[PDB]
Amino acid sequence: SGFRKMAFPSGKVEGCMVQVTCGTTTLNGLWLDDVVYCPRHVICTSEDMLNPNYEDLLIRKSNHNFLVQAGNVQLRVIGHSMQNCVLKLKVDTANPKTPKYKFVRIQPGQTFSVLACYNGSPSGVYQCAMRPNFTIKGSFLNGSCGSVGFNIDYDCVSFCYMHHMELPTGVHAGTDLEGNFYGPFVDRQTAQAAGTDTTITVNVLAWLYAAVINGDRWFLNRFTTTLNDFNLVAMKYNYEPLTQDHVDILGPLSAQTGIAVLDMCASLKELLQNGMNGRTILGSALLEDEFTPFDVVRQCSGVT
Amino acid sequence: SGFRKMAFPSGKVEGCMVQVTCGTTTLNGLWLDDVVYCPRHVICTSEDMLNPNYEDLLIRKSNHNFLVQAGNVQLRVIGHSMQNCVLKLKVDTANPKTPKYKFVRIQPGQTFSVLACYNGSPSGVYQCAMRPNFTIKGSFLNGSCGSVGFNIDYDCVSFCYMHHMELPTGVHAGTDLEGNFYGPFVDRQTAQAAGTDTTITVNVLAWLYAAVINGDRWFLNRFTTTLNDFNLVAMKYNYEPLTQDHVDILGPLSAQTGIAVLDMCASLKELLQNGMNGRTILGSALLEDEFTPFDVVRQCSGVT
Ligand SMILES: Cc1ccc(NC(=O)c2ccc(CN3CCN(C)CC3)cc2)cc1Nc1nc(-c2cccnc2)cs1
Numbered sequence A, B: 001s002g003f004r005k006m007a008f009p010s011g012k013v014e015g016c017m018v019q020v021t022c023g024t025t026t027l028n029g030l031w032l033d034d035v036v037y038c039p040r041h042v043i044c045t046s047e048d049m050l051n052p053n054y055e056d057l058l059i060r061k062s063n064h065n066f067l068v069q070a071g072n073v074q075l076r077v078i079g080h081s082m083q084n085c086v087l088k089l090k091v092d093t094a095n096p097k098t099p100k101y102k103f104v105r106i107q108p109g110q111t112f113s114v115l116a117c118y119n120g121s122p123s124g125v126y127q128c129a130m131r132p133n134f135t136i137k138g139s140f141l142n143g144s145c146g147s148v149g150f151n152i153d154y155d156c157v158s159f160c161y162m163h164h165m166e167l168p169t170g171v172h173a174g175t176d177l178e179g180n181f182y183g184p185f186v187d188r189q190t191a192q193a194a195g196t197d198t199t200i201t202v203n204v205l206a207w208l209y210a211a212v213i214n215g216d217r218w219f220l221n222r223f224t225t226t227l228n229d230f231n232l233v234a235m236k237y238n239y240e241p242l243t244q245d246h247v248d249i250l251g252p253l254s255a256q257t258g259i260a261v262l263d264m265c266a267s268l269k270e271l272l273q274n275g276m277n278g279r280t281i282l283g284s285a286l287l288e289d290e291f292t293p294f295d296v297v298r299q300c301s302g303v304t
């Protein structure tokens, strides 16, 4: 029983975090085999953030300009190259703690764990979702760049996010581990801002199923809706459209609770139109959209 | 920017988790130096949960009745003893991954990280608070007993909680690592239930400070209250009394925001009496009480 924002255990990633210094800029890197990955803006100056040409900036660097430290051990840099918005620093030692890993790119609406680090040292772990507008609502301070987001499946770490910047509304943007930004953001100084966002409908439905499995039932009703009629309501309240694939993905949770997806959609319509009338669902007075169907199945009992 | 329920990185504890089997019962244990700690109810049967005498049950066990597995490695048990509600299994190998550690007992209102484990294998990490009634609102399924709660300060893991049971309302109870239960609960079958709970006032105030530091200010006002007048309102809404020591503990956050504690108490009084009128604070429509002042300082910027 219970339902929490639960991250993956972080030990496999902790053993990969290093400190990268270039000039007077320090940030975090990810050490896998004999390569350290970090944001390329580590090579920038304050006089460079206006209109940087990173190809120029990197040609003017040598391996000796990069100081890499793993705990109390200095790693010797023997090669450097750019890949999109990340830097690859080849080092003379393979990381003995390298887990089985993959570099994946995630979709908006999917979740992952973030290991927030400062000066190469892990500080905390929390769960994040990629928003529809390709930002994340993280918790990061100055020094956190190069912190990573990941999921773990059996023994394998799938890295999906490296942190690069904070936008003016306080939300965060970054890249996959190939250095390609999520969303229409760049690693330079501009007036860039998060675009309009939407609520992740399939996740809200998953979380209503989690609530039923955990004994909250007050929002259920005897009505069922059609998919087209539900999607008219979704549009009005700035929810994403629900697809048949979403309905299919919710199949296991529907079977376990015996509540058809379009039955639960009729509950969600009533919550959107009427509010909660002073009640809560899984300790929240808002509809929560940062749990995927997978997250719910992973955490919740499977009985029925 | 941002504010998340953030756990401590879990790697130091992951390396301590083992599987303990006795008969057909499997649960988790904590392997530190050459001792494995686990709930003593691992030695129980279904015909024993009524009125167990654990001293009798343990006298009838031998070391060979305990199977301990660390990953794919079986640990040989060479001694067993009871300490209050935990069992200490002496093994023939010290854990090479033992961190610096302490066994601490926490106070109601304090927070800690939980590493949820199944079959000796870590599954997820989340943040928990000890409620005033000595329960925790965790996320645990069958098989999770023996999972631990902890905080980390510099290199040192302070273990404070071992999981033993789920109460009828879905909340959880357990012991410190000396085997002494938090609250009026026992590791046998009774009608025991969580007692009445209260909201942790100093934590709500800390979280309002976190909100101000993160730019939410709509709930602020020009009024200040007295401590006695605030505590009359606290009583009415089932909040704990605020003490001068609480005011002192909030000193750093008050100085950083320039908002006196009794000024912020006047905001909290208005929120309690009027609600939020459709607005949110740090993405919540409820007043959140599971962040301590320390948690806020640890996570939030320190500027001002
Ligand atoms: C996207 C980006 C692009 C360039 C930079 N770098 C800089 O602005 C910068 C870097 C280094 C310097 C110092 N110079 C270079 C070193 N030395 C020669 C002195 C002069 C001055 C400015 C940072 C970022 N990203 C940032 N992320 C944050 C941040 C804050 C809070 C949460 N998450 C991210 C702050 S700045």
Ligand SMILES: Cc1ccc(NC(=O)c2ccc(CN3CCN(C)CC3)cc2)cc1Nc1nc(-c2cccnc2)cs1
Pocket: A001, B022, B023, B024, B025, B041, B044, B045, B046, B047, B049, B140, B141, B142, B143, B144, B145, B164, B165, B166, B172, B186, B187, B188, B189
């Ligand atoms: C407090 C307590 C006391 C005794 C027990 N153990 C049992 O009830 C029990 C243990 C073992 C058996 C099997 N027997 C012994 C082994 N073998 C001889 C077969 C017969 C039957 C029952 C469990 C607990 N705690 C439990 N925690 C949970 C639980 C569920 C979800 C979340 N957190 C905890 C379920 S039972």
